[PDB]
Amino acid sequence: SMEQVAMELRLTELTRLLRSVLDQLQDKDPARIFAQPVSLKEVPDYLDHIKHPMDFATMRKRLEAQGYKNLHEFEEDFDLIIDNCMKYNARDTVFYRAAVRLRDQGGVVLRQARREVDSIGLE
């Protein structure tokens, strides 16, 4: 149907905007601490601690499959990256501090992304 196609175009448009958002957020992680999933070979007990691991590579895979239906779903995954890290790692670590800086700088980006999604009507 034509309606289905129009909905699919909206999803494609949203995916384009979220790809831009994801690139901007990942730029705020210059150490690439959050670039890849935590390795279960190197941290064998990780899943005992963290029930829903997340990272930028995994978000990017879901994004390119157009798997984010709205900005909220995207933000949920981004918050997992930060929140998982701030639980597993202590305050005095380079990991925790990187997450704090990513959250603070990323908030700025996500603030304007929400305006753009609402404004252009992408969800």
Curated annotation (Swiss-Prot):
Cross-link (Glycyl lysine isopeptide (Lys-Gly) (interchain with G-Cter in SUMO2)): K41
Tissue: Highly expressed in testis.
Domain of life of the organism encoding this protein: Eukaryota
Location relative to the cell: Nucleus; Chromosome
Residues in Bromo domain copies: 9-113
SUBUNIT field: Component of some HBO1 complex composed of KAT7/HBO1, MEAF6, ING4 and BRD1/BRPF2. Component of the MOZ/MORF complex composed at least of ING5, KAT6A, KAT6B, MEAF6 and one of BRPF1, BRD1/BRPF2 and BRPF3. Interacts (via PHD-type zinc finger domain) with unmodified histone H3. Interacts (via PWWP domain) with dimethylated and trimethylated 'Lys-79' on histone H3.
Its biological purpose: Scaffold subunit of various histone acetyltransferase (HAT) complexes, such as the MOZ/MORF and HBO1 complexes, that acts as a regulator of hematopoiesis. Plays a key role in HBO1 complex by directing KAT7/HBO1 specificity towards histone H3 'Lys-14' acetylation (H3K14ac), thereby promoting erythroid differentiation.
Protein name: Bromodomain-containing protein 1
Chain's gene name: BRD1
